[PDB]
A paper describes a structure:
Here we reveal that one such toxin, TacT, is an acetyltransferase that blocks the primary amine group of amino acids on charged tRNA molecules, thereby inhibiting translation and promoting persister formation. GNAT superfamily enzymes catalyze acetyl group transfer from acetyl-coenzyme A (Ac-CoA) to a wide range of substrates. Here we show that bacteria can acetylate the amino acid on charged tRNA molecules through the activity of TacT, an atypical acetyltransferase that displays unique structural features including two positively charged patches at its surface that are essential for toxicity.
The conserved Y140 natively coordinates an oxygen atom of Ac-CoA to ensure correct orientation of the acetyl group for transfer. The asymmetric unit of the crystals contains a dimer of T8 with an extensive dimeric interface burying a total of 4,739 Å2 of surface area. The T8 monomer consists of an acetyltransferase fold, and an Ac-CoA molecule is clearly visible in the electron density of the active site. Compared to that of other acetyltransferases, the structure contains two unique features: an extension to the α3 helix and longer, curved β2 and β3 strands with an insertion of short 310- and α helices (η1 and α2) between them. Examination of the surface electrostatic potential of the TacT dimer revealed a positively charged groove leading from the active site of one monomer to an extra patch of positive charge around the α2 region of the second molecule of the dimer. We modeled the coupled acceptor stem of the phosphodiester backbone lying in the groove with phosphate groups interacting with the sidechains of Arg-91, Lys-33, and Lys-36 and the positive surface of the α2 region positioned to interact with phosphates from the remainder of the tRNA molecule, with sidechains of Arg-77, Arg-78, Lys-146, and Arg-158 involved.
Author numbering:
A (entry chain B): 4 to 161
B (entry chain A): -4 to 160
The structure:
Amino acid sequence: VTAPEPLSAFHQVAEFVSGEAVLDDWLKQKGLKNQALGAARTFVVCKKDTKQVAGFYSLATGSVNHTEATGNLRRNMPDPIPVIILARLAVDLSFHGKGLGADLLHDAVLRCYRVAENIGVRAIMVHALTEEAKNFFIHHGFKSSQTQQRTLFLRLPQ
Amino acid sequence: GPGGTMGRVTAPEPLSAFHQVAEFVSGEAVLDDWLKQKGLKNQALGAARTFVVCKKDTKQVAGFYSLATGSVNHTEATGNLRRNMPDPIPVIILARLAVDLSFHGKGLGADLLHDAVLRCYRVAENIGVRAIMVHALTEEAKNFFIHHGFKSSQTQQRTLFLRLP
Ligand SMILES: CC(=O)SCCNC(=O)CCNC(=O)[C@H](O)C(C)(C)COP(=O)(O)OP(=O)(O)OC[C@H]1O[C@@H](n2cnc3c(N)ncnc32)[C@H](O)[C@@H]1OP(=O)(O)O
Ligand SMILES: CC(=O)SCCNC(=O)CCNC(=O)[C@H](O)C(C)(C)COP(=O)(O)OP(=O)(O)OC[C@H]1O[C@@H](n2cnc3c(N)ncnc32)[C@H](O)[C@@H]1OP(=O)(O)O
């Protein structure tokens, strides 16, 4: 695949299938529209020598109240806690099991660290859609909320 | 205007341990004390990023502002801010803004706000952001933001927004 780049009208998305239709349909129907609105910024990777999207993720600003956080995350912090929402992350079924999911997450993390140089950010927050998704994030260092087991956080040490 | 001094200040730069803040006074003690007690600590925690301007040829702070990520529910927004948007709406919070009493009335409050706005537009290239949000501490502060293009929430006059796209 190609290096991560911003979603554009040059990207072919209509055939993308990840196994989660809510994510597939968001990419195809709302991805580019929501970029113009300031609702989310989407980054894609493409099959080599094509503009066919092989995987993507989306980032938006956000916050979390102390009750949905963890004991360590809320320590000595204001309420609510400033976060970046990793709103969506998916790889096409044809590319599963090749480390592209991990690679996309790593790119997202680095981009959040860069954003955090100019704006206050405590953590990356994700809402896991399934138990399998939650376990993927746990494997990569995310920690669950105490009240919602599918809300997870990755503290950005600074 | 001339304000209280005709000395200059430096360009905005990140708060650091090299900055003197202990003598800063803005007319609002809550802001003065946040800067002195929490400014640098909160930077390391990821609670807020603070940018300062200093008296020329010193490291003495003459003004500052602070930025953090945040969001707002549709009920607390405006119709134009929320139309076709997810709920809640992604924003950047202008958490703190203050100038030392000695430099009031010189356009430094406007200059700091302008630098804050440009910094938000740069951030927005990498992350979804709909608007800058501010909670005005006083009536005087609210009117200052209105003069520079911010719009009040319909329910709360002291919560104001500046749309970016
Ligand atoms: C993002 C949200 O908002 S929540 C929804 C999450 N997204 C989805 O569920 C959409 C459908 N699923 C997918 O798109 C993919 O399965 C992804 C993106 C979750 C993972 O990508 P994949 O290609 O399957 O995994 P990839 O090959 O990158 O695996 C990377 C590492 O994670 C591990 N891993 C992958 N899936 C899981 C899992 N469910 N549980 C634990 N570990 C996992 C792999 O074993 C590998 O580990 P290693 O480096 O120690 O060998
Ligand atoms: C950010 C928050 O969360 S709210 C808290 C805001 N901060 C504070 O209250 C701390 C105490 N006050 C201050 O530090 C300062 O008064 C500031 C930073 C708010 C403003 O800075 P000042 O030095 O007073 O104003 P500055 O000289 O930059 O004024 C710039 C312009 O705005 C105008 N202006 C200033 N105050 C007001 C006001 N209250 N109402 C309308 N217009 C105003 C000025 O006349 C000038 O207009 P122009 O550019 O058309 O000539």
